[PDB]
């Protein structure tokens with residue numbers, strides 16, 4: 589689709605069989621989702637946001653559907669105020685900025 | 688232009704007579720610039736994201752040149768390491784997310 593920005597660019601994602609709402613975030617390098625259980629092992633990562641740094645759990649090669657498009661990649665899990673889809677997955681679904 | 692997201696979508700901006708680099712950020716409601724002086728009145732504001740909240744100065748009716756595209760709107764000024772152009776000015780230059 590073509591998504592204008594008068595409202596937050598919120599989309600439905602499917603991860604772990606569950607539907608969630610997430611924000612398409614070109615200002616995010618990484619994808620960050622609120623606390624949920626994911627399979628496999630995870631690795632530590634510190635990420636920096638507007639208010640400071642937080643610890644997250646890094647799960648690699650996670651299957652996730654994003655507004656109907658299939659991605660398989662790294663998902664960070666932690667106390668983010670909102671689920672965000674960052675450039676690591678926006679590139680997988682072929683998204684670009686246009687003006 | 689069409690901007691891919693393989694890397695950070697950074698552009699040149701002109702604001703308060705200064706040239707600066709800024710991130711085109713669809714996840715940002717508002718435009719947030721690193722500490723600088725701007726003309727006019729301002730009022731304090733708290734904005735939040737990963738890591739918590741920061742205090743900023745809200746300047747209304749500021750003109751910015753974004754990648755050669757003129758826009759006017761509210762600009763928040765405060766302690767961020769990276770300038771971000773948020774949806775309130777992205778709309779004004781007709782930016783969209785496409786995939």
Ligand SMILES: COc1ccc(S(=O)(=O)N(Cc2ccccc2)C[C@@H](O)[C@H](C[C@]23C[C@H]4C[C@H](C[C@H](C4)C2)C3)NC(=O)O[C@H]2CO[C@H]3OCC[C@H]32)cc1
Pocket residue numbers: 613614615616617618619620635636637638639668669670672674712714715716717718719734735736737767768769770771773
């Ligand atoms: C009301 O007006 C607002 C305007 C801005 C914001 S915001 O907190 O800056 N954020 C919105 C937001 C994000 C998450 C949850 C809720 C809201 C925008 C994100 O795009 C933000 C930008 C930056 C802007 C600068 C430079 C960096 C670090 C921070 C300052 C936040 C990205 N990017 C981010 O956090 O990315 C993180 C995940 O991916 C990683 O890679 C990059 C750092 C790691 C909140 C309110």
Ligand SMILES: [Cl-]
Pocket residue numbers: 759760761775776
């Ligand atoms: Cl505005």
Ligand SMILES: [Cl-]
Pocket residue numbers: 592781
């Ligand atoms: Cl429009």
